[model samples]
Target chain A: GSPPKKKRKVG
Target chain B: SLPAMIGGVYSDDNNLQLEATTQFRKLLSIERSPPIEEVIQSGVVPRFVQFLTREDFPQLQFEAAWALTNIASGTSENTKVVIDHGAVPIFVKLLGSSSDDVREQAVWALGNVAGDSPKCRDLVLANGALLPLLAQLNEHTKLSMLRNATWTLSNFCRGKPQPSFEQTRPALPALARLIHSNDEEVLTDACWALSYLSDGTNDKIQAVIEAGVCPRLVELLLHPSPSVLIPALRTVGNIVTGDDAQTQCIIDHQALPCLLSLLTQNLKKSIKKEACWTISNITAGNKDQIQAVINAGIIGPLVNLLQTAEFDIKKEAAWAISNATSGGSHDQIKYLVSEGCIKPLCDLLICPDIRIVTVCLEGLENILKVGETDKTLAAGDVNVFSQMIDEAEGLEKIENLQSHDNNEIYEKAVKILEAYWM
Candidate 1:
């Protein structure tokens, strides 16, 4: 698989 | 009391109006579950919204804004009432209020409205809330104001259909200042905002790098407070998703050593999972970038996670190793296999996730291809890695996947067996 998806943390 | 309060709010006397507004704000300020319904039904929302324009009476404006803020803090339906009464545009205006208390209260009120939902957040931004709100964030401001203003700025950057890049770009310098604050609350929200801004395309990531906070953000990976560390790690993770040069920016800042600690020492599985995910992005970059991950002593811990971690973390760790095999130079791939990556890759062939399974099969194929080339060079009939897969029971796992529900996985499994075992 491609690089594992990057996660974004929300407020 | 409701009618009397509304009457006082509409009274000719300023003292009475302020007194009434303060009492009404207090009524809505219950520690938990305030009387939002009764306050809205009394038709006092419009009057409170009007007092938002009471520039001459900062106290009245402050009270009115506090009441509206608390009301907006309720259900989305309640926030809609405040928006419909024109609270958003007025709140934006109040961000420029001369009184520090009034300005800070406006920041707090906008945070409530913006946090209610994406629609309200967009409405707050469309009314020109970004600059003035950021203007309130600085070292000279009170800690409470800085915290509230930083949180409100985070709301502006968050949610789907995010605020436009141009519109939110101005927040970077402010965020740079905030990350330096000794207060964890300010740093947490500030880092969360950076996480959101860097979530987009490369220009957005470049904007963050240009803002000059990456070194500090990387340093924060080891912060003792999980509250602060999670967002800080997330922002760094997002930055690595950019181009090779951008990913290299993180590497140059000594992020790899910090990440090695997280993988080895951090107990929170979620944090470890995130650290692995970050490393995976670097592995996906060019060969030197992939080598950066290897040189940091990351492969051992990563392979460890793939073998023993929970499924969620294993998925990330799998990507870290598999992507390296796909992108790394031949020796780098050998280094990964030498560190005992093949057995874990074979074991995960039966992973419930199809994409992971596909990558694992591809990784095995890549390793065997190198072994085949080695056989030709050394004039040996035996392929060393083919025997390694057999020794690890990988051949049986690939054999079992022939009947996989996914046609692609079945095809790849068939292809690997025909290419190697035959």
Candidate 2:
């Protein structure tokens, strides 16, 4: 629900 | 499906009752059948609930409880709710002492079904605290079947939607873990099934299962003497590994990786393959050494090949597995991918006109241009080749042509490769 935690950094 | 034990009116005619009971018990053994409504419409489920409390005929109680169990087993969240609401839970939960924890086996079995059903009826079963199993006299039963069914009765309490918390399942953990050691398949399978439920695919909760010292027994089960034991057991181990790197390592230390390798690569059912891949993905999501271990297993080709070779949904799993492998994989391994010549087939993943091939080759293209691309050595000779493979199956223009792709991620990601590598 929160989206992948690394979305801001990784693809 | 059996004819009634009597040809006349329903009553406690002893000999006729015995025949009726024996016949109903046989009906319990069928794997698939008619309808719960017929059983209910004719008043059987109601009487079944009554039989759950009878000590005079514990055997009758066993048969009645089972008849209702298979009714719930019909696999409907809707019908299962009907079984529970029509007095299954209240009768099931009352003492669990439970007012009759030992004798009310059938009611508890029905309670397990509704709990196993869905969350709405988490209210149905838990409404009276049925989830907390009463074990004071549980030792009194030597039969594996009671312990087996009982594990699920309690286990289903741990089974939940959104899912139950670690603390929510803590009360039942001790009793559940003990039987996982039994050589009998049913009892151990149910025990493992229960642990799998509690782990709930969650970290904190999985740690709860691990702390109780259940990891090795479960991994030992992977090499189970009975093939069916590992099905649920494998998933239980997978659920635990998904917990954390330490959790993943705990399983691997038992030499789980090779079995894991066999599972993912060997021929198998898609459902089990899916589970194997999921476990592989989680294990690879670990530290560099762990990633290297899976990378060493030499799965890159199948993973990349699976994109074109496997079905679309599984391609997503392949993408994740490949992505995970390259994420922090050893530089040598990444170089090995290039050497293995995986890049051309991967590039030839024929980005041309797939279902956009999720196009964007999920474009985050491994950005990871395999990003271990040739290091200019402070000296460069490595790229004697174009991961451009220099042309398409159709020739250069085919890949070059994708710049016009309707989807921008496809366009943009391709643009990155095209503009920079161009």
Candidate 3:
């Protein structure tokens, strides 16, 4: 139902 | 700005009612939501506007105006319109030069909040001569705090659309040159915003800013540690790079890119990061070399990676960058995104319910349709639009699948993409 997400520590 | 606790309703005791209104003013000042609702339910908004006209209680008037400002700032269109519409705009604004205007920085703070919140409110502020404070500051009623605050206020309301009033704001641009020379961080920050964000608006204002010789001044100041100052400055320069071959040639002809690249890659907060990536998006929107300058600075790779796990808004900016890239990388008919970078992540956007990514996948899909789905079809005999130029990225399987997409534009664009291009 939603796009998957990934998150990062750097800019 | 943590919220103050709320009060029970005002009683027949006039003394207690005054005390409640005073505490209510202080509570509204706290940066929380409940106080605003409390203030409204306490039925004092109309009362505060009335208090605004009372000359005897400067303290209450002052607190009342500040209270109204915070209520207007309550983070929603519907919340703001209550104060904005209480028939408050007219009486409140006509007071700027009075002693009330001074103790009452009330008008300045309140109008700015509404103007700052949204375009509908900008239309709310601009004509009321509510926004006329910045206009008053540049030539007429000059106070640095008022000037800076109004500048902060004015710059915001400038960036919205409904372009008929765009030039109505043009006279305010003259303040930019005067503002560039300030020694104060807040002042520079204000001027920087006026120029920076305004540059993001209509082409003529950007032209006026660049020609007024404000660009080089903004370009010269890029290394500051203050984010409020640095962010808007880089954003201004970034927005400048949004077009013109000579323009984007660029400010990297060469002004602030590398330091900006450093800010983008390191030590930034999320608020700053959103601005940072937004600046980068404007950069990528430039011509090939400008795009290369941005890529060479080393930010693009991480940006591609950002889509994998940044928050929603940041993800939106990342979406813009990769779309620019995948859209690029047209050199081979492969319609594959990996050539420039991110194909799987992008193709996969994992093909799910995105914010439709304005779906209908932006409905322009890299149709840059896998147009090897190319009209000759640009057949190098890459007639290569083989079903077979590949929609199944392997199964793009008419993921246009929706038993129901309610938005007409979404359905129209999706249906159009399939019928015309895909």
Candidate 4:
């Protein structure tokens, strides 16, 4: 599996 | 100039600091193409790191972490800027924040920093971010926080120079808990975490198995989403790569049926390719293990893949059949040969890849070696196995390969013909 990126959605 | 934006963060007025931080975050978070270079050029990262410690303003800390997260999402050089200015320990600290949004945003920031490179991942782990992160891998946590934490957990597990198994073993229970979630995002990362964690020594593989995720992971093999299936299959694949007992855990969970579905029914070539890779590992296990794979009716699909799937898929399929010949019981080897393993095995003998060609020659030789023993038992003169190779065009191909550039392959090809054809 590819190393995942963080979810970019802001609060 | 963006200098005022820079100046605002350093000013005594808290409102100016808040607005400047928010704008910096906003600019960095632009969906298609963030102005990461420009904002990073402004050299406001230290102040953003500064805002994370503001216990009086959770919103400012949230904005600062979010900005740093996006900044870290840029090139490793950009990520280093955030890390160099002291964002890691603060992010670890914010993981303990009283505010839900602050905690979630902090998880996101650490993910980008860790995801940037193995060096930073070790840095983030060394700061004790994992214990705090594990605390957030809760079923009852807010959806976004759970999602952020799960994805971050995978980054912690991903890449070479893997986090020490002891450092990562603590995550298995949390990952085991996260796997039960119905959320696709959570399952995806959770399964991904298992994939990375299990992809190691038997002790590490044993740790994941003891966490007791095999049953659920097998169930997930039939999941409708490729997102879930890919990693689920991968984790299962890694498990089978272990010793016989460890490989048996996957077999006991009835993974073969789902593996059959991916091989024959799945549309995506990559999924089929991985399914083949997974089956190859299973076949490499001991005899009953190979029999379990055969009993699941995997041989036919495997033969079909070897005969018709594209090069990479065919290569894996060849391994599945070849490993079976090398390790299987006589009856099992006979079954594989009768299932048309020979034609494709012979066909791949001419493939461009030296490894696959070697696997084909060795598999054919193993089958023929079995046949020679059977002939001796019957006191018969007919070399039926050699005849099968000749019928499949394998003899002609081997004749061509006696002149192959690789001396080892050339020798093996010549040896098989001399032993059989003579």
Specify the highest-DockQ model's number: 4
Each candidate's DockQ: 0.04, 0.01, 0.02, 0.44
Best by lDDT: 4
Measured by TM-score, the strongest candidate is 4
lDDT for B405 in candidate 4 is: 100
Against the correct fold, how does model 1 do in TM-score? 0.95
In DockQ, how does model 1 score against the reference complex?
A: 0.04
TM-score against truth, every candidate? 0.95, 0.66, 0.51, 0.96
Q: How does model 3 score on DockQ?
A: 0.02
Model 3 per-residue lDDT tens digits across residues B1-422: 11321232224444554566667666655544435565576555766666566565565565556556566655554245454545345433534535534333544444445444455445455556434544354434345444445443444434445333453354345445444544454444445445434444446445544545445444534545453445445445445545454344335434435435544554445534544454445435544643553445534444444444345434544444444544344442142233333333334334344553443244234543454445564446443333332442522433443333546435644564465444
Off by more than 4 A, model 3: A1-11, B1-24, B27-34, B55-60, B75-87, B91-95, B100-104, B112-120, B138-144, B151-168, B171-217, B245-253, B256-266, B269-422
Per-residue error (Å), model 2, residue B329: 5.4
Q: Is the docking of candidate 3 incorrect, acceptable, medium or high quality?
A: incorrect
lDDT of 1 by residue, B1-422 (tens): 87788899888789989999988888887666678899999888999988889888888998888888788878889888988998888888888888898888788788888787777777888899999887766657888788778888888888788888888889899999889987988888899999999998999999999999989999899899888989999999999999999999999998998999998994698999999999999888999888778888898888988999999899999888988999988788888889999899999888778899988888898998888888889999898999999899998999999989999989988888888777
Native contacts retained, all candidates in order: 0.00, 0.00, 0.00, 0.35
Over B123-191, each residue of candidate 2 has an lDDT whose tens digit, in order, gives: 544554434444432546445435444444444444335335533454445444445545554444444
The order by descending TM-score is 4, 1, 2, 3
Q: Which parts of model 4 are misplaced by more than 4 Å? A: A1-3, B1-3
Candidate 4 per-residue C-alpha lDDT over B1-422 given as tens digits, one digit per residue, 9 for 90 to 100: 47888888889788999998888887776766888888877778888888899999988988888888888888888888988898899899988899998998898889888887788888989999999998766647888888888899999988888888878788999999889889999999999999999998999989999999999999999999889998999999999889999999999989999899898784688899889999999999999999999999999879988999899899999999999999998889999988998889999888899999999999999999988888889999977878888899999999999989998889999998898888
User: Once model 1 is optimally superposed onto the true structure by TM-score, how far is the C-alpha of residue B403 displaced, in angstroms?
Assistant: 1.6
Which prediction has more favorable DockQ, 2 or 3?
3
